[PDB]
Amino acid sequence: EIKQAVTVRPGMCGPGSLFVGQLGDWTWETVSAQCDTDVFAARDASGNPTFLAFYYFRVRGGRELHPGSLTFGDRLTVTSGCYDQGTESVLTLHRIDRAGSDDAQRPLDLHEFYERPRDGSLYVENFNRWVTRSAPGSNEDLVKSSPPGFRNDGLPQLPAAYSPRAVYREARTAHTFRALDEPGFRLLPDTVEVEHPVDIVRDVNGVGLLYFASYFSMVDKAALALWRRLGRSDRAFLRRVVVDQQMCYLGNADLDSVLTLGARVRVSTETPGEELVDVVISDRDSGRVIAVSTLHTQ
């Protein structure tokens, strides 16, 4: 496992997608270190660039520590490592604690991540799958790969129960990561449906796909539209606390697409100001759901 001391920089915090962007770069580094392949320059046998695409992404914090807690110069301890998911994919976990936290030097513990998460630590799960394009300049119909050098044989095992697959399968079906039958919540009747042309000035990565962190900005763009429709103020929006968020990346899209962003919310009937917001990103033209996200806020 990889432990690092991190002081929070402008390029990894704030109300945008910079933190999630840093998290994914750490993911690519941690896999490179544990899987004997340079993930950044990865190509298949043929010479085709192969990308370790984000597929399932979770960030879980709490009141004591969440992404909105991080400010310039915060001292953090980050512990990272991969878990075996076979030859075509890999799960990467990252734990973040405030430096000099009680027990901050803890090693990665699957039981802690999946069943006993502590208020005051941030837990990150990135389930990634190697992909290539099926055709130059197309971002649709990407094809599963495994770069020749990729080695999952050194990695620790994950037990069947902690499988990200069961998690994301259920989310693609239900369009939420939190079952509608969860007790202690009531749906609100206002929803929103926003058109979003791909933003080529902002949304595009260095290999001409939609950048994984842009999905989090698109999701927040929908949350904002629904926030506003509820009457609420730009100001209180920036005060929103996100204690948990899950994202499934079902597809990418060509750079001329017009996407649709739909959002709904359930309000706690147990705690005031606790809310579960569901966002679905569709590419209506290809009949594809390309993303689903649930956000647990306060």
Ligand X SMILES: CC(C)(COP(=O)(O)OP(=O)(O)OC[C@H]1O[C@@H](n2cnc3c(N)ncnc32)[C@H](O)[C@@H]1OP(=O)(O)O)[C@@H](O)C(=O)NCCC(=O)NCCS
- Which residues of this protein are in contact with ligand X, per CB under 6 A? 51, 53-55, 129, 131, 142, 144, 209, 212, 249-252
Choice between 215 and 227, CB closer to Cl ion: 215
According to the annotation, is 152 in a ligand binding site? Answer: no
Cα distances from 96 to residues 56, 60, 152, in angstroms, run 19, 10, 24
Q: Could you tell me the smallest distance in angstroms from the CB atom of residue 116 to Cl ion?
A: 32
- State yes or no: residue 156 binds a second copy (CB under 8 A): no
The CA-based dihedral angle spanning residues 174, 177, 179, 184, taken in that order and rounded to the nearest 10 degrees: -150
- State yes or no: residue 92 binds a second copy (CB under 8 A): no
Helices (H), the chain: 18-34, 110-115, 164-174, 212-229, 234-237
- State yes or no: residue 189 binds a second copy (CB under 8 A): no
Nearest to 278 by CA among 268, 289, 290, 292: 292
Which residues 6+ apart lie within 8 Å of 102 measured at CB?
none
Taken in order 157, 160, 162, 164, is the CA torsion positive or negative? positive
- State yes or no: residue 230 binds a second copy (CB under 8 A): no
According to the annotation, is 250 in a ligand binding site? Answer: yes
Q: Site for a second copy (CB under 8 A): which residue of 11, 107, 184, 273? A: 11
Which residues 6+ apart lie within 8 Å of 112 measured at CB?
95, 106, 118, 123
- State yes or no: residue 138 binds a second copy (CB under 8 A): no
Q: Could you tell me the smallest distance in angstroms from the CB atom of residue 16 to Cl ion?
A: 11
Indicate the SS3 state at residue 20.
Answer: helix
Binders of Cl ion in range 182-221 (CB under 5 A): 205, 211-212
Nearest to 207 by CA among 136, 158, 105: 136
- State yes or no: residue 238 binds a second copy (CB under 8 A): yes
Summarize as ranges the residues that interact with a second copy (CB under 8 A).
7-11, 13-18, 21-22, 24-25, 28-29, 38, 40-42, 49, 51, 70-74, 200-208, 211-213, 217, 220-221, 224, 234, 237-238, 255-256
Residue numbers in the known binding site for CoA are 54, 129, 250, 252
